[PDB]
Design a protein around this ligand. Structure first.
Ligand SMILES: [Fe+2]
Length: 674
C-alpha cells in the first residue's frame, strides 16, 4: 500500500487504519529547522492504511529539524484524517521520526516534535520552549475538569461523546454504544421475547434454565449446577468477579452476636469460635456501605429492596473458605436473624442469595465503576492536561488511558445517567448508586490501589494460610511485571530524584490528580508531589495496573458469574426475610428478578464481557510514541515477562476445577475501554 511520489527531504506520511482514518482534503507540510522554517509545500489523497512518500526540496537550508507542521484545508466535504506519524530522510542522510497518533480536523494546525522523549529541562531554545508551552496551554483549554455528580471524582467536561475532543473519542461514533450493544446482546442470547415482561416471574428455576442452557459458557454452566453449594458461594470472594471485599477477621464485631454454639456444626478443629478467630481461620465480608442506600423506585409496579449483610466465613480443614453465619442487616435484632447452614434449606439459601445480590451492587458501582473507570479517567485527564506529547510519561501512559474517557462518557450519557439503562435491572438504580459512590470516596485511597499493600491490609496475603486466592497470586505477578517496567522507564529518563522533584509538568500532573480528581481530600493519601524515582515508579504502576489488570479482573468475569441469575441477582423484589422457617422456594422465585429485568441483566453482563476484534493486550504498543532503543528494550523485556506469567497461570489452571484466567496477561486490555 506504499505510494512514493518523486518530483531534498524525503517525507513519508502514514495514515491510520480506523474506519474514517482517510481524507481527501489538501495537506500542507512545513519544516521548522534550527536555521529557519520552510514553505507550506502541498503533498497532495490519503487513504486508510496508506504509507505515502513525498520528495520535498526546500528553498533554503534549514539545519536540524525541530518541528513538523501539518495543516489541512478543506476540499469539498469536511473529512477528518487520522495521522499516525511523519518521517523525514534529510539531504545529510539523517532519519527523523515524528509520532502523531491524533485526529486532524481542519480546525487547528498540528505541530509535532521528533519522538525522542524530553523533559522541560531538556528544552532550552525558544523554538521548542514555545511549542511545549503552547501545547499545554492548548491542552488545558481543550481537556477540562467537571463535576458530573456531587462528591464524585471529577470527570471530563463533556455532556456526551460528541462534545469530546476527537483525539479522545471512539474511532466510530457508536462502535461502542451501550443502548445498541445491550439490545444486540439480547438477540444473540435469544431473549427478545422476554425483553419487556417486567412483571412476569420465572415459573420456577427450570423455566429460567431453559433460557440459560442455550446461552451458557463453561463457568456459567458450572455455576448453574453448583450455585447452591456453600463451597461455590465462598469460592467467589477469592476468585469470582468481585474478589476484593473479603478480609481476615481479628475480632468478631459487636454487631454480629454469633456464638460457638451457633456454628459448632461448621467448625472442624475442636476449637471454639473465638479460638478460631484468634487463629486466623475466620474471615468476614461486611456490606455496611449498603446501609441506608435508597432502593430503586423508577418502576411503580415492582418494589426493589436492598440489604446490608454481614457474612462470617470459615477456612475448613481442606483450606477452603465457606460461609458459616449470615446476618442480612447491620443492626442485630429478633427480626434480623443470624442465618446458618444448619437452618431450613431455603432460609440459608435465601440468606446466601442476599449476600450475592449485595456483592453485585458493591461490585458494579464501587469496585468496577468507581475504582477502575472513574479512577482511570482521572489519571487520563490529568495526563492530557499537564504532560506534553514529547514527555516520557505521556508516551508511557497514553496507551493505558486509550478510550477510557470515551467509554466513561458514553456511560454517563446513556447507562448510569438519569433514566439510564442501569435503572432497568438494578435495585441501586434510581439514584441509590450515586450515594454508594459518595460514601465510597472516603475509602478511595492511594494505598488501597497499591495491590500488594492493599491485599495485606485485608490480612489476605499469606499463601500458606490462604492457599486458593488465585486473584491475589496473579495480581501480584502482573503488578511486579509493571513495577519492573515503569522503574526501567523512570530510570531511563530521570537520572536522580532531584530531576523527578524539579520536573514541573510531572508535579502539575500529580497535583491535578490530587486537587481535581480526588477533590483535594487529605485523607485520600494521594501524593501532592512526587520527589523520588521510587515514588514515581510506584505511582506509575498504580495508574497502569488500575487500568489494565484490576479493570480486567473485575470486568471480564461478569458473564461467567452473573449470567446465572440466582448467583448474582441485580435486584430483589421482596424485602429480606425477618424470620426462619417461613421462606418457600416459590417465594424465592418471586423475589428474584422478573423475566424483563433478567434479560436486560443478561445482555448487559454479556456485552460488558466481550473483547474487541483487535483488542490491545498488556504490552502491545502499536503506537510508537517511544522510538528510542533503551525504552523499547524495556518494553521488550516487559513483553517477555508478561508471557512467563501467562505460562505459569496456564500451568496452574490445568490442575483446577474452575480456572482463574482473568489476569492472564494475554487477556488483560491495556486500558479501560469497555
Ligand atoms: Fe469496564
Amino acid at each position: 500500500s506504499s505510494h512514493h511520489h518523486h518530483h531534498s527531504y524525503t517525507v513519508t506520511v502514514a495514515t491510520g487504519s480506523q474506519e474514517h482514518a482517510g481524507t481527501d482534503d489538501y495537506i500542507y507540510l512545513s519544516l521548522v529547522g534550527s536555521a529557519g522554517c520552510s514553505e507550506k509545500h502541498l503533498l497532495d489523497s490519503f487513504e486508510r492504511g496508506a504509507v505515502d512518500s513525498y520528495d520535498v526540496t526546500v528553498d533554503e537550508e534549514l539545519g536540524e529539524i525541530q518541528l513538523v507542521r501539518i495543516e489541512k484545508r478543506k476540499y469539498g466535504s469536511n473529512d477528518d484524517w487520522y495521522l499516525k506519524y511523519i518521517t523525514l530522510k534529510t539531504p545529510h542522510g539523517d532519519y527523523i521520526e515524528f509520532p502523531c497518533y491524533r485526529w486532524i480536523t481542519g480546525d487547528v494546525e498540528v505541530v509535532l516534535r521528533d519522538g525522542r522523549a524530553k523533559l522541560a529541562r531538556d528544552d532550552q531554545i525558544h523554538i521548542l520552549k514555545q511549542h511545549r508551552r503552547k501545547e499545554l496551554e492548548t491542552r488545558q483549554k481543550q481537556y477540562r475538569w467537571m463535576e458530573w455528580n456531587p462528591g464524585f471524582p471529577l470527570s471530563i467536561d463533556a455532556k456526551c461523546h460528541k462534545d469530546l475532543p476527537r483525539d479522545i473519542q471512539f474511532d466510530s461514533e457508536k462502535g461502542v454504544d451501550f443502548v445498541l450493544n445491550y439490545s444486540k446482546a439480547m438477540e444473540n442470547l435469544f431473549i427478545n421475547r422476554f425483553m419487556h415482561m417486567f412483571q412476569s416471574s420465572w415459573n420456577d428455576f427450570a423455566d429460567f434454565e431453559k433460557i440459560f442452557v442455550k446461552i451458557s459458557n463453561t463457568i456459567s454452566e458450572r455455576v448453574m449446577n453448583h450455585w447452591q453449594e456453600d463451597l461455590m458461594f465462598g469460592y467467589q470472594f477469592l476468585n469470582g468477579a468481585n474478589p476484593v471485599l473479603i478480609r481476615r477477621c481479628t475480632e468478631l464485631p459487636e454487631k454480629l452476636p454469633v456464638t460457638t454454639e451457633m456454628v459448632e456444626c461448621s467448625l472442624e478443629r475442636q476449637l471454639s469460635l473465638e479460638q478460631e478467630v484468634q487463629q486466623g481461620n475466620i474471615f468476614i465480608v461486611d456490606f455496611e456501605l449498603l446501609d441506608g442506600i435508597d432502593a430503586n423506585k423508577t418502576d411503580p409496579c415492582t418494589l426493589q429492596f436492598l440489604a446490608a449483610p454481614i457474612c462470617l466465613l470459615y477456612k475448613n480443614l481442606a483450606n477452603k473458605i465457606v460461609p458459616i453465619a449470615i446476618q442480612l442487616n447491620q443492626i442485630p435484632g429478633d427480626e434480623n436473624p443470624i442465618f446458618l447452614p444448619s437452618d431450613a434449606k431455603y432460609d440459608w439459601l435465601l440468606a446466601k442469595i442476599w449476600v450475592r445480590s449485595s456483592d453485585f451492587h458493591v461490585h458494579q458501582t464501587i469496585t468496577h465503576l468507581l475504582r477502575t473507570h472513574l479512577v482511570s479517567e482521572v489519571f487520563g485527564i490529568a495526563m492530557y492536561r499537564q504532560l506534553p506529547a514529547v514527555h516520557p510519561i505521556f508516551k508511557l501512559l497514553v496507551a493505558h488511558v486509550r478510550f477510557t474517557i470515551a467509554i466513561n462518557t458514553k456511560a454517563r450519557e446513556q447507562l448510569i445517567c438519569e433514566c439510564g439503562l442501569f435503572d432497568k435491572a438494578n435495585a441501586t438504580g434510581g439514584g441509590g448508586h450515586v450515594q454508594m459512590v459518595q460514601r465510597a470516596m472516603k475509602d478511595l485511597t492511594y494505598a488501597s490501589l497499591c495491590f500488594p499493600e492493599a491485599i495485606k491490609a485485608r490480612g489476605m496475603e499469606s499463601k500458606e494460610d490462604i492457599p486458593y486466592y488465585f486473584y491475589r497470586d496473579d495480581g501480584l505477578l502482573v503488578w511486579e511485571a509493571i513495577r519492573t517496567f515503569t522503574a526501567e522507564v523512570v530510570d531511563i529518563y530521570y537520572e536522580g530524584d532531584q530531576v523527578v522533584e524539579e520536573d514541573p509538568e510531572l508535579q502539575d500532573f500529580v497535583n491535578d490528580v490530587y486537587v481535581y480528581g480526588m477533590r483535594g481530600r487529605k485523607s485520600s493519601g494521594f501524593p501532592k508531589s512526587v520527589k523520588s524515582r521510587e515514588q514515581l515508579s510506584e505511582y506509575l504502576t498504580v495508574v497502569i495496573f488500575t487500568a489494565s489488570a484490576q479493570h480486567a479482573a473485575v470486568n471480564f468475569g461478569q458473564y461467567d458469574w452473573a449470567s446465572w441469575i440466582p448467583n448474582a441477582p441485580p435486584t430483589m423484589r421482596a424485602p429480606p426475610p425477618t424470620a426462619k422457617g417461613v421462606v418457600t422456594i416459590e417465594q424465592i422465585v418471586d423475589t428474584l428478578p422478573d423475566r424483563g429485568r433478567s434479560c436486560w441483566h443478561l445482555g448487559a453482563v454479556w456485552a460488558l464481557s466481550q473483547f474487541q476484534e483487535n483488542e490491545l493486550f498488556l504490552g502491545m504498543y502499536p503506537e510508537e510514541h517511544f522510538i528510542e532503543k533503551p525504552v523499547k528494550e524495556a518494553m521488550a523485556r516487559f513483553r517477555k515477562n508478561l508471557e512467563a506469567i501467562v505460562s505459569v497461570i496456564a500451568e496452574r489452571n490445568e490442575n483446577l476445577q474452575l480456572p482463574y484466567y482473568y489476569l492472564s496477561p494475554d487477556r488483560i486490555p491495556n486500558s479501560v475501554a469497555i
